[PDB]
């Protein structure tokens, strides 16, 4: 039913390079700061190494592109499309690791070595703790935005019902950090069971299984992923235990041990060490043969690059002096936290042409009716937030004038 | 006497793909919650990353299957069977590590650096502690369910120590894997219910009996297997209670005064599975079953196959928290805390159709191997007493291999 | 526009070896000490395993070079230039790790396992702590000095009302000079201007700027003179979790928590910061004391040392051991702390080894135009200094070139590797 | 001009095996013990896994060796010399790690997580601490003893000792660097308490690889291997006056309890981390086929130097004697000792070589080392002032290569 694009998309020998140049984001890693005197504007964005970067890369429409020689296709019977054959995700800034925390984290006791009876249950025992998150590197590439999975509140023990949800991963969405891919805002009502940079967020994980089994293969031309973590500490929660331990799993205590302590345990993660050798980025990927049926065809003259890279999640400390005095006083200083991200996206594109026979027109229409409509032979994604990368005026045919271009010519023997 | 299936099972060039689609299990990682007014009515099942997943995969009987053209075999003289030539065990959810504990764990002292005399006295010094378990990945494939080993209470036959006996049993869906405390029946061998965390303290932890399964004459249990285990000692504790076997007098000089009353030498460690990484993953990659080591080269007798999996690398337990009363300031009594765990699978197979010419010698051989094969071919089920995760593929077979992920991989890998 | 040097630079079979011999630096890893008079003299330089070493290597002008027979060179139509084809960065001293600290580090609480309410109030809760930094190995090679990136104080629009008074951040490019500090785990920033309390990082960077190589910019340079070749190995993990004292400049928004009361009414600082750790150093992961053959550069300059000079940039924290020195002010039969003075010193040992290949260029009209657009000084200096404002470790090889390759370690390696 | 020995040293097809047999050293790892009255005699030597082992291996002079048939060379016009073509450094004892410490280590505060103000004053705050040192494996081979580098006191706002880098011959028993650098601790640390006692009155040396590699003739390093590792285990600061105060532009002054600045004379303790079999450099053969330097294994002077550091067997054994036997335990009834042992077994394969004493070759050799021709008869040895572990193989040479382990390995490797 579905066939490879190799069977109805003809390749030319025409290649183009396009680069975004340096992309920077600067903000607060834990939360954005809205403008107090203009509520519709953000004063400081939320910029964190635990966010997805979802780039919507806009390509020049090859059917309107000022090629010097346009005799390679017949506009009466054919249309043009770009194919992505090479990519490098440039990453700036040094390798490093940031931390995240909560001034009122719901940690009660340390349950690793010593937690004797009786409990000391007050009504507000939250503590100001921080941690370093699970480490994640990944890149997804396709002509359709990626699909994530996360757990949320479903439809109806008083435990919230769990439902697995699919959604489009948007630029700025949070990746899972060690506490799972879930809607923490709705499933953790106390706002204190995870650090503040996810406690009112949804952490999403790429739905690799769903995307890979898509018939046309528009979501994943190519992907890399590297995750790691271990358990750094063991805590338990304050609050009522919603599901008591059944009586067949213990002999009751008495006296000092009569009032059972909370078995609502939770670990803290740690991503451990970051190293250059395990970097996925700053090297080229050649999209020669995709596993799916879309062999890199950028339908709609666009392409989506999704990236998570926690290996440069350093958060910088900033400190201002409000009063200059000869001796040190805390009240004379203000402390800030800032995080930055540096990207440089480089592509090699191959021009393709499609002869629109009756059979091919039916196939394309069944696959995506917008393709023929846009070819002349409202955009549904504008409700989503992406990092827009406009390459319409960035295409160059002089491949050997750019780093990735030289690599392509050398690799391909051209 | 036993020969390879390659000698009497004819391979065709007909291949079919079958996939389970998304399989989800959601529950409490530490215990099930029973309906108070029923016994087999579960309100919340026990779903944990430390459980065996034993999938009983039902295949369509090829002798009754709607093939478009069956002219490739003579039903008067031959019977059909599926062979598994490819499989990928898909795993969803992010990598992570969960913890387990006991609100009354029988830990007395930390015995790593400082445990001075004299012994502190008590009758209930249990503590509310947790740990992260040994890390295990494994994958078994066969047309017969897998066999486990575990230590249990033997026969009663200067020590009241329970006798130990090594038991074999079928590993069922939901059985607990060993966690760092060994493969034993904790319910019967640890009578106090407090020496290990609550998710195994009343369970039997089983380890696959690889040696027995591997030495089976016909080799139906293990077409293929992968395994990756690791742990280290994170902490050193000792037990409270009477020491059942005192240290002999030739191993120490007796103390006096504050050291006159000997402290408990019933030590026990806590395990740690250490780090989880993508590179060490066994799953989300294809396995091509070309040449089995045993005599059964992937033949799915009885139109079924058993896929057994342990994967602790996605054992994260999600914290859930409900608000009973909304108030402007934080109060512990206004919230309830829950724990939930989920597992996501996607089993993908490529099967090769095979035919067997039922000569006199071959029927004799097959009857000796398993008399049910010829009876079901027409030329009750003892496994109904066991619990498996049923995966019904009777309506999931497709000849359009290139329309599915594993199907494309198979066509590419085989040059077809 | 830009073409590979392979298209207009002719390679000869003439090879030369040159070595710097042992290069030593000795000083204080945390700060320099000035002569009280003379003020602009250094008494003890600042020498640290966390510094960049930027060697400006001077080569003999091959167009004036005493070759045994120069009849192969026609000065009427061609000029000579050296190409670097082999390099080894020798490192002496044992592998090891140093630590850095601050007697008044702005650490308030340990936020890893226990930090209950209420907070302890004070005005000066600084502590005397130390740490081991992120581990970095790198070496860059080109005929132009390298470019670093670092964050500094930018410009703040004043028409824009500031609800946050946080300093604006700007990414700055600069030439990396010998003695500049590498990033240590707290990022590449100007700590002197962006941390006004002088207490948020150890003293060896608290009044310094830590720089990171701008690899992306250097790689995208049209001619590729900065990076013939580079190697890099970074690693770190989080060793401890602390928070800062001082007023929190950006309060946590009210939608991320339920307010406290009583002991928890005054929120504690969420201005967290980790301490880094470079972890283990091993021989197996060393980048140095091994040869590199510069056969084919990724950029268009395939190792041509224009201007008869070469830049070697090195970071190597794997030998950052700081030696403890102790003098006895008064000899007594029993120990007393006041009888001794404690000092710290650090040393660095280098040995740079090169193999150069002689090249000649026939100066046609087309090539002269190309080179002039590339750099007009090349044709001027050939008869056919802007870098003096920067600080480099000068390595003069003008009189160290030898044709007897097999008389030297790297020369023997080259002859064997190339089959000569 | 220097040329390879390949150009003037003729190889024969004559090979010999030689082995040292078991070499044992037994002593105290921290210090030597003199005879209790007589003092120039040692009762217990200092034997530690942190020492260099420098073996001076004496070979039989081949020009005086009882060969059965000497028609392979002309003794009037030629001289004989041995070339080393194979070597294995045998190591006995199990892998393990020792620790070193000081009963009066100059450690003031733990500066890793908590070191608040004010500093408490004292005059003697030294502590009884220990640590495990940096891990080092290495082996050097040449016909000349190896050269080490270390920092010592040189000549000539700061009273800090001037530093000079010194070269010296590494002798048997010299200390390797341990994590505190290669320096003369006796002269540069006057308090004798800034490092553990096994180096506080010693010089820790590091091989001057750069100097030896650049020697024209290449006599020091036929071949070498090295593997070092460490991390920082703890962070401390020193007591005593700070000799160089922190400049005023690097901090804002304190007040009250923070008025008296604390010592920023930090120092780490090292740790060599784990030792494993897989990273072993020893107990495997090295074939010296073609050296990088110009001396291709020629053992001038009928000797060769094998230098080893191996901290991967640095276990220190605990010994304990009973002075009074009593029914209850008392500390004063026992004496505690520490002992360390090292087990070596050096195995060599040598190839016999001949040199024709032409006018040109005698001139070349005379310029290289005037002693070579003198010793050939065509005298105080200068190395007698240095200490080496003497290994005499004069009576250990055998032509029956296949009767010994390394000999068999050589025959197999070389196709003979």
Numbering used by the authors:
A (entry chain B): 20 to 175, 183 to 403, 437 to 473
B (entry chain A): 20 to 176, 182 to 403, 437 to 473
C (entry chain E): 20 to 403, 438 to 473
D (entry chain D): 20 to 175, 182 to 403, 436 to 473
Q: What's the paper's own text on this?
A:
The native T = 7 HPV virion can be mimicked by an empty icosahedral shell, called a virus-like particle (VLP) which consists of 72 L1-only pentamers. High-level neutralizing antibodies elicited by L1 VLPs can block HPV infection; however, protection against HPV infection is type-restricted, and there tends to be little cross-reactivity among HPV types. Each L1 monomer folds into a canonical, eight-stranded β-barrel (BIDG-CHEF), with the strands joined via flexible surface loops (BC, DE, EF, FG, HI).
We solved the crystal structures of pentamers of the lead double and triple chimeric candidates H58-33BC and H58-33BC-52HI to resolutions of 2.5Å and 3.5Å, respectively. Further pairwise comparisons of the surface contours of wild types and mutants illustrated that the most distinct bumpy protrusions between parental and targeting types were located on the side-chains of K53H33, N57H33, K59H33 and K60H33 for HPV58 vs. HPV33 (bottom left), and K380H52, S383H52 and E388H52 for HPV58 vs. HPV52 (bottom left). By loop swapping with a few aa mutations on HPV58 L1—i.e., S80N, N82T, N84A and V87L for BC loop, T375K, G378S and D383E for HI loop —the resurfaced structural contours of the BC and HI loops of the chimera nearly recapitulate those of the HPV33 BC loop (middle and right) and HPV52 HI loop (right), respectively. To verify that the residues exchanged on the surface loops of HPV58 introduce a similar functional surface area as that of the corresponding heterologous type, we recruited mAb 4E5—a conformational and type-specific neutralizing antibody of HPV33, the binding of which could be redirected to H58-33BC and H52-33BC-52HI —and determined cryoEM structures of the 4E5 Fab in complex with HPV33 WT VLPs (HPV33:4E5) and both chimeric VLPs (H58-33BC:4E5 and H58-33BC-52HI:4E5). Similar binding occupancies and binding angles (60° for H58-33BC:4E5 and 60° for H58-33BC-52HI:4E5) were observed for 4E5 Fabs bound to L1 monomers of both H58-33BC:4E5 and H58-33BC-52HI:4E5 complexes (middle and right, middle and right). Further analysis of the mapped epitopes suggests that the 4E5 Fab binding orientation and footprints covering both the BC loop and the EF loop are similar for all three VLPs-Fab complexes.
